């Protein structure tokens, strides 16, 4: 019981959903498990958009343990992918046979693009289980993950994502099934994200960072890696897209640069086959600009598609927090 698995299903686009049970008796939802945010969100019967009506919507009136929050707060969140709004409440959650009572969460009432048709019209969004820190907790006293640990005192305070039908969130421990070699540890900074100091960044022989304080954030909620907007053109000039097939892409990418993230004594090298994705016979880098609240201009995300596909990540919760990285098996 004390180390347990949450199998993740890869639905398109990317991100990866697991089974969460909410309310009494339990209603099932398939949220994404997001280290890049903190709030729990659940799509509800309050959302009357077609994008909500098409999924399994949580019905708070069917939950005996649901309590609408006393403070009637409307939360608006602008993600990089779209916007969600709704109100706040409390309920009992079940994750992987573990109970988490009196958990604050957002009840989705609305979903939109940030500008007509939006991402939610394409995907099957049912919510977010944020695994970030209290600095982006919009309502309530305690983040989900800290609450689960509080109410489950024999769980070790850690979780890890193994990406790629064999993706799984492992809570309380790790498995040698998922990684090779050693795990190196970096201290977490600030109060919002699984954020670490970045000392330098090279694209092949070119140093492109760092002269100010800079940071990497480990974000399972985003497929892509990122750079700050000022370095958008930097990256696009040094790493071109190019024609490729399934048959020749290894040869085409032999000429591409190694991207080196320098975290002090630890250097993570992303080889071309680890950061270039093949879509429509084009090799394109899995990098884009994305606004990071509270870390504009100096944050670099490491996402799921490039980074976690190749590197097993362990997230150790301070009881100071640490991130562990090792090569995926
Ligand atoms: C292959 C492309 C997939 N894709 C675009 C669709 C994503 C659909 C699922 C979804 C919907 C809502 C939210 C999320 C996921 C999670 C967030 C994640 O929490 C972002 N974390 C950061 C730190 C960047 C952040 C930004 C803004 C607010 C914030 O609050 C603390 C945190 N993902 C995204 O904002 C996002 C952005 C661009 C592309 C994609 C996802 C993406 O990979």
DSSP one-letter string for 142-178: S-HHHHHHHH-TTS-SEEEEE-----EEEESS--TTS
Kindly state the DSSP code that residue 273 receives in the 8-state scheme: H
Q: Are strands 20-22 and 225-226 parallel, antiparallel or unpaired?
A: unpaired
Q: Is the CB of 14 under 6 A from ligand 1?
A: yes
- Whether residue 106 contacts residue 87, with contact meaning beta carbons closer than 8 Å, is answered with yes
Residue 178 Cα to ligand 1 midpoint, Å, equals: 25
Residue 290 Cα to ligand 1 midpoint, Å, equals: 9
- Whether residue 238 contacts residue 203, with contact meaning beta carbons closer than 8 Å, is answered with yes
The experimental resolution of this structure, in angstroms, equals: 1.7
Separation of alpha carbons 89 and 137, rounded Å: 14
Distinct helix (H) and strand (E) counts, the chain: 7, 27
Q: Which residues are catalytic?
A: 34, 219
- Domain 179-328: homologous superfamily in CATH: Acid Proteases (2.40.70.10)
Residues 6+ apart with CB under 8 A from 11: 17, 123, 124
Q: Are strands 206-209 and 242-243 parallel, antiparallel or unpaired?
A: unpaired
Separation of alpha carbons 162 and 174, rounded Å: 10
Q: Give the residue ranges of DSSP H helices in the chain.
A: 50-53, 119-122, 144-151, 232-238, 249-252, 272-275, 309-310
Where are the domain boundaries for CATH 2.40.70.10 in the chain?
4-171, 179-328
Residues 6+ apart with CB under 8 A from 115: none
- Architecture in CATH of 4-171: Beta Barrel (2.40)
Separation of alpha carbons 321 and 137, rounded Å: 17
The sign of the dihedral angle between the CA atoms of 46, 54, 219, 153 is positive
Residue 181 Cα to ligand 1 midpoint, Å, equals: 31
């Amino acid at each position: 019981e004390n180390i347990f698995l949450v199998p993740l299903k890869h639905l398109r686009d990317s991100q990866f959903v697991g089974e969460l049970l909410v309310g009494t008796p339990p209603q099932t939802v398939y949220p994404i498990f997001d280290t890049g945010s903190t709030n729990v969100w659940v799509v509800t019967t309050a959302c009357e958009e077609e994008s909500c009506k098409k999924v399994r919507r949580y019905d708070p009136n069917k939950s005996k343990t649901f309590r609408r929050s006393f403070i009637e707060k409307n939360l608006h969140i602008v993600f990089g992918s779209g916007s969600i709004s709704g109100s706040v409440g409390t309920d009992t959650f079940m994750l992987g046979k573990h109970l988490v009572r009196n958990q604050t969460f957002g009840l989705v009432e609305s979903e939109s693009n940030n500008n007509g048709d939006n991402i939610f019209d394409y995907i099957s969004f049912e919510g977010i289980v944020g695994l970030g820190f209290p600095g982006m907790l919009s309502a309530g006293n305690i983040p989900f993950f800290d609450n689960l640990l509080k109410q489950n005192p024999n769980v070790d305070p850690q979780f890890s994502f193994y990406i790629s039908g064999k993706s799984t969130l492992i809570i309380g421990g790790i498995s040698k099934s998922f990684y090779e070699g050693d795990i190196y540890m970096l201290p977490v900074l600030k109060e919002s994200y699984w954020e670490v100091k970045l000392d330098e960044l090279y694209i092949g022989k070119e140093r492109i960072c760092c002269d100010e304080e800079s940071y990497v954030i480990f974000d399972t909620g985003t497929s892509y890696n990122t750079m700050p907007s000022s370095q958008m053109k930097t990256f696009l000039n040094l790493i071109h897209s190019t024609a490729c097939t399934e048959q020749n892409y290894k040869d085409i990418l032999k000429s591409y640069p190694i991207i080196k993230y320098v975290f002090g004594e630890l250097i993570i090298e992303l080889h071309p086959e680890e950061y270039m994705i093949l879509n429509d016979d084009v090799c394109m880098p899995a990098y884009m600009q994305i606004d990071v609240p509270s870390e504009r201009n100096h944050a670099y995300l490491l996402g799921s598609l490039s980074f976690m596909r190749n590197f097993f990540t362990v997230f150790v919760r301070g009881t100071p927090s640490m991130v562990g990285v090792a090569r995926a098996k």
